[PDB]
Design a protein around this ligand. Structure first.
Ligand code: CLA
Ligand code: CLA
Ligand code: CLA
Ligand code: CLA
Ligand code: CLA
Ligand SMILES: CC(C)=CCC/C(C)=C/CC/C(C)=C\CC/C(C)=C/CC/C(C)=C/CC/C(C)=C\CC/C(C)=C\CC/C(C)=C/CC/C(C)=C/CC1=CC(=O)C(C)=C(C)C1=O
Ligand SMILES: CC(C)=CCC/C(C)=C\CC/C(C)=C/CC/C(C)=C/CC/C(C)=C/CC/C(C)=C/CC/C(C)=C/CC/C(C)=C/CC/C(C)=C/CC1=CC(=O)C(C)=C(C)C1=O
Ligand SMILES: CCCCCCCCCCCCCCCC(=O)OC[C@H](CO[C@@H]1O[C@H](CS(=O)(=O)O)[C@@H](O)[C@H](O)[C@H]1O)OC(=O)CCCCCCCCCCCCCCC
Ligand SMILES: CCCCCCCCCCCCCCCC(=O)OC[C@H](COP(=O)(O)OC[C@@H](O)CO)OC(=O)CCCCCCCCCCCCCCC
Ligand code: HEM
Ligand SMILES: CCCCCCCCCCCCO[C@@H]1O[C@H](CO)[C@@H](O[C@H]2O[C@H](CO)[C@@H](O)[C@H](O)[C@H]2O)[C@H](O)[C@H]1O
Ligand code: OEX
Ligand SMILES: [Ca+2]
Ligand SMILES: [Ca+2]
Ligand SMILES: [Cl-]
Ligand SMILES: [Cl-]
Ligand SMILES: [Fe+2]
Lengths: 334, 135, 243, 176, 95, 36, 119, 102, 155
């Protein structure tokens, strides 16, 4: 009808194969640029100087290293927190040596998932669903924006960020255990309680309906066949699954109704992990986990060892060995 | 050990004599150690000048020696270098410089007398403590 | 801008360029045999870009390629230094004694290495041609300094392999341990060739400037490789006053 | 006491980056999504049997008609993610399978660590960590961090051997 | 190829201080050498002699009195372009 | 590169420009029920 | 109420006056030649530096001297500050004889403080 | 030499990894000869020995100690403040027996 | 740096442990800044060391002979009062023993709003679902009879 309304009427239309609608028009270009640059710089980037002094570390597959290593390695300590586009360097070879392409796949990737946040909201309004699924996606976006962005703000430069590769991540975590002590911090400890709870409740809820399935097939075929997709009758009875678990544990402490059950399935890792995401986000301003170093003591004052200084004797060692050339002054407070 | 009296003996004056210290003045000496003797003397190391440790391997070598706690309350009355050459009351908390360092106003001589008694009781009960601390 | 006024001398790159005087090549300040209120500012934004490449195919394969600076704009050093002395006849000595020096540059030539260049001014003792009254925007300053290293006795490689402390010659291959060859990490106190000219030479603020030609050694990363040869040529940007 | 045993297995064995542990992180974190994403959509597709405003009023337990859609939920995930569970069973069998085979792959890794077949070392990437200081990578950066464990906490973790160290044998990187 | 650092540690630099390439906290081990006495020593006279110091300009006769108390506790080593280089004397790596 | 910077600066202002008056033209009237 | 400053002035207040008398005889220096010829931000070096220690130093007339004449001695020590606000903020004016008459005011108050309070 | 071959770290079955694949002769090569047993003496005697490297390490730092356990020599990782180095102590090696005897 | 000045070693000549200047190297855009790991905070413009900012940056004409005893003792206090906390009262590096306590309430208030800044993005997104479904009428879920997705065409 109208030419600009011919656009808004394809982009907001709900019969496409994939939904690129209004959050997608920021997403789909600025995620494909984060895809294509990361796939290219995983294999053929030059060495990039992570620590910010002189020595350039290699993270690309033509430089002799394998899949379980070799991130696109982050920016330099020399550029700090400055906005470093590809057009500020005097050539491309100055850009790749100074930790260039990480800021191409952080500032595009983070805006590529913050519009994947609202896109899941957008289709739930584009159908008649109740739209409460973007709030479930704030649980791993904040897992992916505390460590990429927010920890790289308050600690200092963009060098202290996640090296987006598989054993670049493991080098980050031991530094965070070294630099300010992840494990003895309750907001991380609330996170794994959501995750190990979310580990069990996947294999708890997913087991028992797979247990309490009704009989519609015979033995020889798969028992995952006797019903058609989208039927009105249930594949399983909740009344038999109730009193199984009521007879395993307290009868009073089961979940009788399934819509109260599935909320708690959608609560426990989701409210858990944005404590752990807020752990690293409150780690970002150097509000750290506590130390029980030298805590118990004799009436002399002679130091009794606990598990916490055995933790710290491991934590002294990674702190006195990570970034082994830059520190010229005896505190690593930067 | 029970922290008995004769392990809390240390020479309080210049080169000739000692004294016995009771229990409760050490704990307020510990309390003023964690208030004003605190941000640059955690674990006996000195964070701004990194080799002026409070170990008695090194506290004896600063002349005149800083083991006598009447000398040590004089060395917070009049701080100095290792040789006694110049005062460093620009750069150090003192009672000579209370107008510069305002935290030294709510303190006395006897409130320094026990933190001088505190600071060398700690290497009497631990070796690693009040040392480099790397190990 | 009229003058710089340091808050506008933030990230705009009007900042790594010291004193440029006016076009007046007629200042003869005429010193005699005494001491000096010894000179200021002295120092260089090191770039044209010229580099000699290693031959390996013997006696040919000279003839310089150019190079690209693969890193930011801190090829510079600044304000101290330069005790000046007039010896018995000519040759007009120059002593550096305690200046701010040695920034470190990384380049790549056509050929995909990254040799770590070192613009060092460590103890220049500068000779000079025959008998000058004073510099006339014509005379040639030329000698060498001594250069330092890359590993300044603590720069570990990634298997902690230095001489000066730091885990002698091997870590992880425990039975092929003491056979490798790259663990002799020795330091040196070299001398080479360098030239520095003069071209502008103002009268009132009395700052003299003009070209340079530095020829250095490359990196020896606690003694893996042999050095390359680099003709670094840029303006000097000195400033002179005296007794 | 578990947290010591964590940093034991970082330094003395490199329990990260052997592949049998890394399937277990795919098991648990993959398990944590599949109960989170399945907990969302049953609370996103609901069926108007109540007339009040909270949803889990008037859900009968003796109710044969199914309380979530699965036709709108398949239409939701075929568009957003592009792939979607096109039958309501094996949505629950996958939630059983994804953390149980995560722990089983994690269980057979520490039996390799029991006889300390660690796979901390790569057969490559070490000889030109020896010959070549120009070869600069994260893995050789990571393997010197584990030396930061094994000579720092081991006199204090195990006083059985009375390991005592004279403070210049310990690996210190710099001024720290 | 003796790696140029431990070989200097064998010739009395590991044993006593040496005044040429000695660290500044080596002077802390003797009573009365730190900062205002070792500042004139480490910057000016690492020349050739155990007895040439006590005759450097910059100290008094009370300042040379501490020098003669521990006069036999150093030998002058030959100079090193590994250990004097780097401004390593005034600020080392141990803290 | 300054020749490139404007070309990237066009396409951010094109796509965010077609996001900021995307929602401005009815975006609560294609919510498949009342007032669709 | 204490008249006798035996060690109270002779260690403290005669070093309180001695450090800013030492900046004072120096002060006909590069700083006057900054406002003679041509150096804008090295005056702001001096006002927060050597005159930053002329004022943070000259601050404990409360904490050392005679509490009856203390409230009349605050604003003597405030007018020396607040005139030197016009010294550093006429550097963005780019006209160095508004700052030159600001520097001549520091003759009228600093040595007038140094003539006063020998107590 | 069979008794000396069983007193080697490189025949103890703890070391070896999951993906360091192959025979033990890909780890060391072929065993050629014993070359004796080291005996470490200082400038004074003071005999001292090395009995170190337990199994679940990979890189044990070299310590040299006396009969009761006080350390007399090591390998200094930072040679600024060494007091127990090899060079100041002047340790000698007596290599007794084997191929390289005396 | 100025501790070194008392010692007297010349600042410019020395090369750190790693080739760069131990004290005074140059930032990527020309300002002579402090060396080491301090290259990230090369934009520091606090009230002290603004009398060390010369024309380019930290000028070495005025970095020597013009440090004041007030100027260093603020930075001596600010070194040990770095924002480095525990949960409870522990201060300084995490590895370091808890001799003294100071949480530095810059840091101790910065994270506390970031708990509440992120949580208010949670509820805003979770009210925008219910508000958009308030006018659309399916805040209680989809209908039994006129399901809107069965009206939609097949893929
Ligand atoms: C919609 C998708 C999308 C988004 C969000 C971005 C966003 C960005 N790109 Mg990008 N890019 C895109 C598509 C997108 N791009 C495409 C399709 C390509 C391929 C041609 C690229 C190629 C590309 C390169 C090669 C680089 C970027 C860079 C950048 C970053 C800085 C650009 C800038 O100066 O902003 C300036 C923006 C404005 C001044 C906005 C003005 C618009 C109106 C008037 C204001 C209203 C908006 C405001 C937020 C309020 C920025 C985060 C740079 C980067 O990340 O550096 C590492 C960079 O070097 N882009
Ligand atoms: C012996 C087996 C065992 C046990 C009992 C635990 C138990 C625990 N671990 Mg642990 N852990 C184990 C093995 C074990 N782990 C192993 C093998 C590893 C790997 C090396 C870890 C690694 C690990 C980490 C890294 C962390 C924990 C943490 C925790 C605690 C919270 C976890 C949580 O909420 O789970 C989720 C599951 C649920 C919430 C379901 C409920 C389970 C609770 C615990 C049972 C309640 C029982 C009740 C109070 C008893 C009274 C009965 C009642 C009816 C009255 C919990 C005490 C975390 C912590 O610090 O918390 C203190 C933490 O950070 N563990
Ligand atoms: C993204 C992070 C991540 C994730 C998701 C995982 C995931 C996992 N890790 Mg892992 N890990 C990581 C990072 C991670 N790792 C890092 C960085 C390190 C350091 C290198 C480690 C080091 C590590 C170690 C050392 C081990 C794991 C193990 C595991 C597995 C957990 C086993 C478990 O829960 O059993 C939980 C425990 C049980 C099921 C035992 C039975 C206990 C019963 C069920 C509870 C009893 C309840 C009773 C009422 C008591 C409660 C009351 C109590 C409060 C009093 C799982 C695969 C373990 C593994 O794979 O070994 C098989 C293991 O040993 N991890
Ligand atoms: C949001 C960013 C992000 C991404 C993409 C990954 C991805 C991965 N992590 Mg990881 N990680 C992250 C953040 C991230 N992590 C953070 C913030 C931490 C804490 C610091 C960790 C800590 C961590 C540990 C401790 C471990 C991993 C592991 C893994 C791998 C398998 C885990 C898995 O199956 O996930 C479950 C999720 C899914 C199955 C959904 C599918 C997503 C797939 C896995 C993404 C594939 C990644 C790849 C780059 C995408 C390419 C697409 C192409 C078009 C460009 C995988 C490559 C494990 C590993 O090494 O295994 C090899 C492991 O041991 N990570
Ligand atoms: C249990 C039986 C057994 C035992 C202990 C060994 C042990 C050994 N063999 Mg041998 N071998 C076996 C079975 C066995 N083999 C079989 C069945 C064959 C025929 C295929 C061979 C063929 C064979 C050859 C041809 C050679 C050896 C050699 C060797 C020795 C070198 C070490 C090695 O290769 O480890 C390497 C071990 C690994 C790399 C571990 C593999 C781990 C697997 C891949 C994990 C699988 C995980 C799985 C994919 C995940 C499941 C998915 C999940 C979803 C469920 C070693 C003593 C060599 C030798 O010394 O001979 C002179 C040699 O040349 N073997
Ligand atoms: C000596 C001799 C011979 C003795 C024997 C004879 C004798 C005298 C006996 C008497 C002794 C006796 C009886 C007891 C003494 C022993 C004793 C006290 C043992 C107790 C030990 C102990 C600590 C027990 C507690 C631990 C325990 C069993 C459970 C922990 C419970 C807990 C805190 C949390 C469990 C987690 C939880 C709430 C899970 C439910 C959430 C969830 C997702 C459910 C999934 C789910 C739920 C549904 O609801 C339905 C519907 C479906 C679909 C579904 O997915
Ligand atoms: C250059 C380039 C590209 C480089 C990339 C290389 C690189 C850096 C990384 C990649 C390397 C890589 C992938 C490493 C991982 C290797 C690894 C550990 C693999 C796992 C192998 C293994 C044996 C693991 C053991 C455990 C195991 C089986 C895990 C499986 C994990 C898994 C499949 C998790 C599923 C996660 C997931 C997508 C969940 C969402 C499920 C989903 C779409 C639900 C949708 C949905 C929900 C509803 O509620 C309803 C109602 C409906 C209807 C519905 O549909
Ligand atoms: C001193 C301690 C600290 C104090 C500060 C903290 C106070 C917290 C108080 C919280 C108050 C609200 C709790 C209930 C919320 C709710 O609406 O649930 C509603 C549902 C349905 O209840 C349904 O409720 C129905 C009743 S009615 O309809 O609501 O009237 C009825 O059908 C039936 O009972 C049941 O099915 O409750 C449940 O699903 C049971 C789960 C337990 C309660 C929810 C907890 C959420 C998960 C745990 C989160 C932990 C965080 C960390 C995780 C790692
Ligand atoms: C931006 C919008 C577009 C998103 C692009 C990315 C979308 C990718 C979606 C996954 C593709 C399909 C995979 C399952 C293939 C498939 O067809 O699944 C189909 C399956 C649904 O199966 P049905 O319900 O049809 O099964 C019918 C029954 O009869 C079973 O037979 O979906 C799932 O199980 C999802 C869980 C596994 C999803 C695994 C995700 C893996 C992510 C990628 C990891 C590897 C990457 C390697 C990189 C180096
Ligand atoms: C009232 C609390 C304090 C006491 C009792 C105290 C005590 C001492 C003592 C006894 C010494 C000499 C140690 C020796 O000779 O070996 C010393 C040195 C030193 N203290 Fe403190 N101190 C205190 C507070 C501080 C604070 C807050 C700082 C930080 C500004 C500090 C910085 C120093 C420095 C830098 C030295 C070394 C002087 C030098 O460089 O030569 N002190 N202190
Ligand atoms: C900074 C952005 C501020 C924009 C301010 C001006 C807003 C102008 C609105 C233009 C929106 C375009 O939306 C148009 O709205 C008109 C208004 O009648 C409708 O008609 C059209 O169907 C629709 O295409
Ligand atoms: O570099 Mn990356 O990193 Ca986490 O810390 Mn602070 O700075 Mn270093 O430290 Mn410990
Ligand atoms: Ca007080
Ligand atoms: Ca020595
Ligand atoms: Cl590191
Ligand atoms: Cl540092
Ligand atoms: Fe369901």
């Amino acid at each position: 009808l109208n030419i600009w309304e011919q656009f808004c009427g394809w982009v907001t239309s709900t019969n496409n194969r994939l939904y690129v609608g209004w959050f997608g028009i920021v997403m789909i270009p600025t995620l494909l640029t984060a895809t294509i640059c990361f796939v290219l710089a995983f294999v053929a980037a030059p060495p990039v100087d992570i620590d910010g002094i002189r020595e350039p570390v290699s993270g690309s597959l033509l430089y002799g290293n394998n899949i379980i290593t070799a991130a696109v390695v982050p920016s330099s300590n020399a550029i700090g927190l400055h906005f470093y586009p590809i057009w500020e360097a005097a050539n491309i070879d100055e850009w790749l040596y100074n930790g260039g392409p990480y800021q191409l796949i952080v500032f595009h990737f983070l805006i590529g998932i913050f519009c994947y946040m609202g896109r899941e909201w957008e289709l739930s309004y584009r159908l008649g669903m109740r739209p409460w699924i973007a709030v479930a996606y704030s649980a791993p976006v904040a897992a992916a924006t505390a460590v990429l962005l927010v920890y790289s703000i308050g600690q200092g430069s963009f060098s202290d960020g996640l090296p987006l590769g598989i054993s670049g991540t493991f080098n980050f975590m031991l530094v965070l255990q070294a630099e300010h002590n992840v494990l003895m911090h309750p907001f991380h400890m609330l996170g794994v309680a959501g995750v190990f709870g979310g580990a069990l409740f996947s294999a708890m809820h997913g087991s028992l309906v797979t247990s309490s399935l009704v009989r519609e097939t015979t033995e020889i075929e798969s028992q995952n066949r006797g019903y058609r997709f989208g039927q009105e009758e249930e594949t399983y009875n909740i009344v038999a699954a109730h009193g199984y678990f009521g007879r395993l544990i307290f009868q009073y402490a089961s979940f009788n109704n399934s819509r109260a059950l599935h909320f708690f399935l959608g609560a426990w890792p989701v409210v858990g992990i944005w404590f752990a995401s807020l752990a690293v986000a409150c780690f970002a301003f150097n509000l750290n986990g506590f130390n029980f170093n030298h805590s118990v003591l004799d009436s002399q004052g002679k130091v009794l060892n606990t598990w916490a200084d055995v933790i710290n004797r491991a934590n002294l060692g990674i702190e006195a060995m990570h970034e082994r050339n830059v520190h010229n002054f005896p505190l690593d407070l930067a | 050990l029970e922290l008995t009296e004769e392990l809390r003996t240390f020479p309080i004056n210049a080169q000739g004599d000692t004294a016995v210290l009771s229990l409760k003045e050490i704990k307020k000496g510990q309390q003023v150690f964690n208030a004003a003797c605190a941000q640059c003397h955690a674990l006996g190391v000195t964070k701004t000048n990194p080799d002026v440790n409070l170990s008695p391997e090194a506290l004896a070598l600063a002349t005149p020696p800083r083991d006598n706690i009447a000398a040590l309350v004089d060395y917070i009355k009049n701080p100095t270098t290792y040789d006694g050459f110049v005062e460093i009351s620009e750069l150090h908390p003192s009672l000579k410089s209370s107008d510069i360092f305002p935290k030294m106003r709510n303190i006395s001589e006897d409130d320094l007398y026990n933190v001088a008694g505190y600071i060398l009781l700690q290497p009497k009960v631990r070796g690693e403590q009040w040392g480099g601390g790397k190990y | 801008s009229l003058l710089t006024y340091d808050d506008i001398r933030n990230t705009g790159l009007a900042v790594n360029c010291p004193s440029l005087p006016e076009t007046a090549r007629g200042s003869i300040p005429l010193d005699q045999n005494a001491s000096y209120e010894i000179t200021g500012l002295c120092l260089q934004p090191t770039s044209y870009f010229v580099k000699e490449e290693p031959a390996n195919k013997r006696q040919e394969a000279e003839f310089v390629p150019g190079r690209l600076l693969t890193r930011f704009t801190y090829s510079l050093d600044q304000v101290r230094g330069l005790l000046k002395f007039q010896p018995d006849g000519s040759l007009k000595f120059t002593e550096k004694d305690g200046i701010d020096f040695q920034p470190i540059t990384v380049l790549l030539p056509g050929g995909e290495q990254v040799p770590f260049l070192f613009t060092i001014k460590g103890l220049v003792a500068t000779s000079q041609p025959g008998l000058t009254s004073i510099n006339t925007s014509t005379d040639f300053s030329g000698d060498f300094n001594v250069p330092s290293y890359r590993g300044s006795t603590f720069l570990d490689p990634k298997a902690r392999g230095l001489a000066s402390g730091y885990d002698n010659a091997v870590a992880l291959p425990a039975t092929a341990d003491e056979e490798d060859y790259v663990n002799a990490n020795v330091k040196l106190a070299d001398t080479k060739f360098k030239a520095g000219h003069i071209s502008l030479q103002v009268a009132k603020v009395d700052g003299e400037t003009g070209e340079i030609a530095g020829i250095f050694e490359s990196e020896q990363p606690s003694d893996n490789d042999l050095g390359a040869k680099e003709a670094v040529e840029v303006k000097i940007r000195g400033a002179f006053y005296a007794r | 006491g578990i947290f010591r045993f964590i940093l034991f297995f970082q330094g003395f064995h490199n329990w990260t980056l052997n592949p049998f542990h890394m399937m277990g992180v795919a098991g648990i974190l993959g398990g944590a999504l599949l109960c989170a994403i399945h907990g969302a959509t049953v609370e996103n597709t609901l069926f108007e049997d109540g007339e009040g405003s909270n949803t889990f009023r008037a859900f009968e337990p003796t109710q044969a008609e199914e309380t979530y859609s699965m036709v709108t939920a398949n239409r939701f995930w075929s568009q957003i993610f592009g792939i979607a569970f096109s039958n309501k069973r094996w949505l629950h069998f996958f939630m059983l399978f994804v953390p149980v085979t995560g722990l089983w792959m994690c269980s057979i890794g520490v039996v390799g660590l029991a006889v300390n077949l660690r796979a901390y070392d790569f057969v490559s990437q070490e000889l030109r960590a020896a010959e070549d200081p120009e070869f600069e990578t994260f893995y050789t950066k990571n393997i010197l961090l584990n030396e930061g464990i094994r000579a720092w906490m081991a006199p204090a973790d195990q006083p059985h051997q009375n390991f005592v160290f004279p403070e210049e044998v310990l690996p210190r990187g710099n001024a720290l | 190829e003796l790696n140029k650092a431990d070989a200097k540690l064998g010739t009395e630099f590991g044993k006593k201080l040496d005044l040429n390439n000695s660290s500044i906290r080596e002077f802390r081990q003797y009573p009365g050498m730190f900062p205002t006495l070792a500042k004139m020593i480490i910057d000016a006279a690492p020349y050739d002699s155990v007895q040439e110091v006590l005759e450097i300009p910059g100290l008094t006769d009370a300042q040379k009195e501490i020098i003669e108390r521990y006069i036999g506790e150093f030998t002058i080593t030959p100079v090193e372009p590994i250990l004097q280089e780097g401004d390593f004397r005034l600020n080392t790596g141990v803290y | 590169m300054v020749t490139l910077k404007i070309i990237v600066n066009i396409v951010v202002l094109f796509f965010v420009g077609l996001f900021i008056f995307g929602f401005l033209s009815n975006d609560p009237s294609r919510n498949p029920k009342r007032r669709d | 109420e204490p008249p006798s400053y035996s060690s109270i002035q002779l260690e403290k207040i005669q070093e309180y006056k001695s450090n800013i008398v030492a900046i004072r005889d120096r002060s006909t220096t590069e700083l006057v030649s900054y406002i003679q010829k041509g150096d804008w931000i090295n005056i702001d070096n001096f006002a927060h530096g050597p005159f930053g220690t002329v004022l943070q130093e000259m601050n404990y007339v409360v904490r050392n001297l005679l509490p009856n004449e203390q409230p009349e001695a605050r604003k003597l020590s405030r007018e020396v500050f607040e005139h030197l606000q016009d010294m550093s903020e006429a550097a963005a004016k780019a006209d160095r004889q508004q700052a030159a008459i600001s520097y001549q005011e520091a003759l009228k108050d600093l040595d007038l403080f140094l003539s006063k309070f020998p107590q | 030499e069979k008794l000396a071959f069983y007193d080697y770290v490189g025949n103890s079955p703890a070391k070896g990894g999951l993906f360091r694949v192959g025979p033990m002769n890909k780890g060391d090569g072929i065993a050629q000869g014993w070359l004796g047993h080291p005996v470490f003496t200082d400038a004074e005697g003071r005999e001292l020995t090395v009995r170190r490297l337990p199994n679940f390490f990979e890189t044990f730092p070299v310590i040299l100690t006396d009969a009761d356990g006080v350390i007399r020599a090591d390998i200094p990782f930072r040679r600024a403040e060494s007091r127990y180095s090899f060079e100041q102590t002047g340790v000698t090696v007596s290599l007794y027996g084997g191929e390289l005897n005396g | 740096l100025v501790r070194d000045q008392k010692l007297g070693a010349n600042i410019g000549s020395a090369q750190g442990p790693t080739g760069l200047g131990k004290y005074l190297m140059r930032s990527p855009t020309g300002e002579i800044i402090f060396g080491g790991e301090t290259m990230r905070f090369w934009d520091f413009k606090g009230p002290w060391l603004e009398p060390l900012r010369g024309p380019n940056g930290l000028d070495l004409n005025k970095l020597k002979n013009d440090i004041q005893p007030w100027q260093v003792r603020r930075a001596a206090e600010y070194m040990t009062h770095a924002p480095n906390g525990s949960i409870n009262s522990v201060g300084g590096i995490i590895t370091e023993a808890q001799g003294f306590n100071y949480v530095n309430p810059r840091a101790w208030l910065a994270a506390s709003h970031f708990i509440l800044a992120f949580f208010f993005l949670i509820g805003h997104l979770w009210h925008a679902g219910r508000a958009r479904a308030a006018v659309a009428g399916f805040e209680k879920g989809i209908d039994r009879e006129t399901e809107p997705v069965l009206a939609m065409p097949d893929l």
